[PDB]
Every structure is written in structure tokens, then in C-alpha cells.
Amino acid sequence: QVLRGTVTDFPGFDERADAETLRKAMKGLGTDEESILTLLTSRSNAQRQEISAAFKTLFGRDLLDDLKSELTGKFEKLIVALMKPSRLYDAYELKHALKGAGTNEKVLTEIIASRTPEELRAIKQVYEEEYGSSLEDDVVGDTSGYYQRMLVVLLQANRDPDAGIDEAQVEQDAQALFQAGELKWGTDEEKFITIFGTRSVSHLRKVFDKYMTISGFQIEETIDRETSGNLEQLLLAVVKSIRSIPAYLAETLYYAMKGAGTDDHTLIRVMVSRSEIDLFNIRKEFRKNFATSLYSMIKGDTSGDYKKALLLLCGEDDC
Amino acid sequence: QVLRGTVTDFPGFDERADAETLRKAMKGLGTDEESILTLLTSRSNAQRQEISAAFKTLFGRDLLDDLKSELTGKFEKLIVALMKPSRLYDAYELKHALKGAGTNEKVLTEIIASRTPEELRAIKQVYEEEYGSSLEDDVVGDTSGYYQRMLVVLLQANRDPDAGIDEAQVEQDAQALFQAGELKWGTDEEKFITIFGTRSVSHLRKVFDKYMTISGFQIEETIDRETSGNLEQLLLAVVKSIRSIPAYLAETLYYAMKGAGTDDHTLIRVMVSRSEIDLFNIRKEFRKNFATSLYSMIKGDTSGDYKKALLLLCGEDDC
Ligand SMILES: [Ca+2]
Ligand SMILES: [Ca+2]
Ligand SMILES: [Ca+2]
Ligand SMILES: [Ca+2]
Ligand SMILES: [Ca+2]
Ligand SMILES: [Ca+2]
Ligand SMILES: [Ca+2]
């Protein structure tokens, strides 16, 4: 009855002993990648921050700097991602995505659609603290269309509270959504944006069910997952996140490794950002919806120290 | 970093609708065992109590009475066990085991060794409320030897709190335990009983480790698990519960189905009593220590509606 990650506080945690273990793993010309990945994936993010502090006090060096030069490639990127303070991770990912003409719209859609209003408020505050500009201003300056508008409405974090059901409002909203979809989501955008972005989660779940009975198909089938534009991809992410945030992020992981190549940025981002929130539930939705475990997918697509750290973050194989 | 069972509160729970579902499953000459086991194993124990209350209000019948006549065999016993209020289950199991000359010492040892001081205090209060006789008097009246004495000390629920380590006391207690074991646990029983029963869990874990270095073998190997008397079986249960309560109860499940025949009473008791506390960690310990999942063991040894309900209580297969 609760969300659950795969990483928890290590019992009997001694930040000074862990700092010594990590320094022993890199002092000298050699490296003990196994010791580094085993310790860091078994300590919580808060514990990693205390290790980094004890590391600086004991040895007068910077742990993150040492890891960046001692490690390489995707393994380095994963370890560096795990060391980023949890409170800063999403704000950092969004700022990195906001790239003017080269903006990574997948990251904007992923984070803004799947984070709760509480999380988005914290992100907006942290974002201004770290970068001196508002997240909304950066998004507006770097996106266009009603994709921009829907992101702005979601960033407002003003979603209705899970209150009593209103079947009269569940009929009219579902009627409106059926009709915006009939017009290919290119008409009256502000109205379906207000429905997708401000109605309560429990309400929209009933609206999506009422959409089934009115239309004969689920609302997701009005949007092609591969060829649609940015707004449509955001609507799909919002719909799936309304149904289940773990299921949306599980599908995000699935398509990160499906087919030729691997989207390692998305793989690292989802496993790290959700490791202490709902990665266990993501694993369950993954096994149910794609007939194979997240563990087996990671094992088949990745290699080296990078793979073992990802498998330890995944925690277990699912059957 | 938390214990976790396999059964949680059903979301959107409606006790009147569930009562109607259960009545629909037994009204008439037929029975829908699938509907009964699917609903009852997916509702928490507290929710089952509200279903039974709504059942009596809606229909003027007793749900437990209806289940007892509609179901048979081990399936009936499992469903009846799940319906017993959680607050009463251990006290009922102990009273049922306290049978004078036919006393079931395995149940006494299992519950009293693996329950926390907090749980034991609740059990003692409930036991008096339901049966009019303190739990200690019945235990003393139906047990003998220093097995009786060690149970009484454990029932006192006065174990030292997890405080700061004392390596000097960890040397002396382990010396004393090594020496009681050298005398086959038949000398100065009150002295190792005080150590096993009143020292803190974290202290005894260090004592058990210090016992390794002093003796060269773990303390469990001074007791044959199959031929040992009642006191020795209790010492083994206490030692294993000090190391890990989930691991002790996992081993209890393993030997409940190992070999010829099935100890269905123990199987039902552990799965039900630990369904909303630590059955998930029991499943984990089971897979590591016995190279096979609890799911696979239940599947291979049980049958019918009884098996299905046990597998749903188990939750998932472990891999
Ligand atoms: Ca919130
Ligand atoms: Ca602004
Ligand atoms: Ca709310
Ligand atoms: Ca009947
Ligand atoms: Ca308590
Ligand atoms: Ca013995
Ligand atoms: Ca299932």
C-alpha cells in the first residue's frame, strides 16, 4: 500500500569507514571498481553525501573529482549520477535538457509529467536556487506550441485534490476529451490541457474509463507513440502517469533498451532518480507489461562494471 | 530498511460490496471458491473484520459459520485462520498448543522465541482477556525442566534495549556460552538462560560472533536440530531469531514441507501470522538459504484451492 524503491539506508552506517574503503579502492595506480560499485549502490543517497563529506575531512580530497578521473564511460556516468544529491537531480536534468534549439524534449516530458505536485514545487525552488532563473521561463524560452503551454500548466502544480467523485463531471470531461481527440488534438487546446493538467488523478482515471465506454477504444490509441509530435507525446505521458507513474516509467525503461542501441542516458536517469521512490513498483509493472524482467533486459543490453552496478540498483531479478 | 509482509490494505475498499461478493459466492447449493480465496487473500485482516461485520448487517448471517460449512479440509483451515483477528491469533495458537501431556511444544517455542517484547506483552494481555488464565501459569502447568524456565524468562519480555556496545561484556558472555555448550547445556542453566533471554539483540549478535573466534564453530552446531530435547530446540530457535527472525521463520517453513508429508498446521500458521509483518523478508531468506523459492515449495507440495490461496498469500515467485 506504499511506493518503494530498491535502495535503503545501510544499517550500521559509518561514514568514516566507508570513506576509507573508497579511498583504499582508488589510492595508487590501480582501481577496485567492484568495491566502489558495491558500496555506493548499497548506501542511500543521503549516506553518499555524508561519505563525500567524511572523504574531504579525512583525506583533503574531493570524492567526486577522484571518481571522475578514476572511472570512465557509462560506469563513470552512472556513479556520478548516483552521487548527485537527490534534491538536485531533477532540476539538474531539466536544466541540462533545456538546450535552446537542441532541447531534449523527452527529458522535459518525462520529469514534468511523472512528478507529483509536491515534487514539482521542490524542483522549481531548487532550480531557481541553482541557476538563477525560473524553470518556467527557461521552458517557455526553449519550447513552442501548446507543448509549451501544457508543460507550463503542469509546472503550476495546481492539480485538484483527490476528493469526492462527480459522475456528472466525469461524463462531460470524457465527452470533451473524445472530441478533442476526434480533432486530432489540434483544436481547443487550452480546454483539454485544463482537463489533463488540473483535474484530480482519481477523477481522470474515471474520465479515462468513461472514454472507453463512449468511444470503444482507450484514449492512448488516439496518439501514435512513435510518430506523434511533442504535445501528443506529452499527453501520452500524462495519461500513462495518471494511470500509474511506475507503469509509465517502466515503459520508459523498456523503450530505452528495446531495439538497436541503448538509450543509456534514460536508463541511468530513471534507475537513479527512482531508486529510493518507486523502482520496486517500476520493476513489477515492467515484468507484467513486457513479459520479461528489468533485470534480464539490463543484463542483455549492458556490459562491464556499468552492468553490475545497474543490476545491483535493480536489486533482484523478477519472476 | 523496514520489515514488510505480502498483504496490504485493498485500495478503494468497500466492505458492503465485498460482503455481497462473498454471499454471492456461497448462496445456493454451489460454491465459488475462487472468488472467496481471491478476495480474502487480497484484503487485509482488518478489512476482513469489517467484511464480516457488514456481512452480518446485510444478511443476518455469520460469515465465519458460512465459510466453515461451505469449505472443507486444509482450504477451510487456511481461510478460517486468515479470518481470525490478528490481535488474537498468537494467543489462540498458544492456548491451542497448551495441551497438558499432549502439549505442542513446537508452537510454544516458535511463537515465544520469534516474537518481539512488544508483541509478547500484547499476547499476554490478550491471552488473559480471552481465557481467564495468565499465559505463564498455563505454560508452567504444561511444561517442565529448564525448557519451562527459558520460556518463562522470554515471556517476561524484559530484554535489554539496543544500546551501546560493551566489548568487555561481549568477551565474558561468549566465554560463558562456550562453557555451557561444552557441558551440553545441562549445567548452570539459569546463567545461559539469562544471557539468551535478557541481553539485547545487537549484543547477542556480537556474542555469537565472538563465540566463533573463541570456539572455531558457530553456536548452533552445539545443538543437533533433529534429536535435541525441548530446551535445546528452544535455544536454537532463540539463537536463530536473534540473528534474523525472517530467517528463523523461513527455516521453519522449509522443514514444514521438507521430506515425506507436509506440516500443514505450521505452513498455515507461519504464512498467516507473518502475512502483514515480514512474509516478504521470510521469502527472501528462504530463497538464499535453501536455493529454491517458497512459491515453488508450496506449489510442489500442496493442492487445490488450498494451494492457490497459499500462493496468493506468498504473493510472488522469487528468483
Ligand atoms: Ca504532492
Ligand atoms: Ca515566469
Ligand atoms: Ca490532492
Ligand atoms: Ca451454502
Ligand atoms: Ca510495540
Ligand atoms: Ca544439546
Ligand atoms: Ca498475482
Describe this structure in words.
Chains A, B: InterPro entries: Annexin, Annexin_repeat, Annexin_repeat_CS, Annexin_sf, ANX5. Two copies of one chain form a homodimer. With 319 residues, chain A is mainly α. Chain A has four domains: 57 residues, Annexin V, domain 1 (Orthogonal Bundle), CATH 1.10.220.10; 69 residues, Orthogonal Bundle (Annexin V, domain 1), CATH 1.10.220; 60 residues, Annexin (Annexin V, domain 1, Orthogonal Bundle), CATH 1.10.220; 70 residues, Annexin (Annexin V, domain 1, Orthogonal Bundle). Chain A is built from 19 helices and no strands. In chain A, α1 crosses α3, α9 runs antiparallel to α10 and α11 packs across α13. Chain A is elongated. Chain A starts with 14 loop residues before the first helix and ends in a 5-residue tail after the last helix. At the A-B interface, loops of A face loops of B. One calcium ion binds next to α9 of chain A.
CATH topology of the largest domain in chain A: Annexin V, domain 1
Q: CATH homologous superfamily of the largest domain in chain A, by name?
A: Annexin
Shape of chain A: elongated
Rounded to an integer in angstroms, the radius of gyration calculated over CA atoms of chain A is 21 Å
User: Could you give the distance between the termini of chain A?
Assistant: 21 Å
CATH class of the largest domain in chain A: Mainly Alpha
Assign the CATH architecture of the largest domain in chain A.
Orthogonal Bundle
Largest sheet of chain A: none
The percentage helix of chain A is 55-70%
Oligomer: homodimer
Strand content bin of chain A = under 5%
Derived structural class of chain A: mainly alpha
Q: Ions, cofactors, ligands: which are bound?
A: calcium ion
Number of beta strands of chain A: 0
Element string of chain A (H = helix, E = strand) = HHHHHHHHHHHHHHHHHHH
Tell me the count of domains of chain A.
4
Number of helices of chain A: 19
The two chains with the largest interface, and their residue counts, are: A-B, 10 and 10 residues
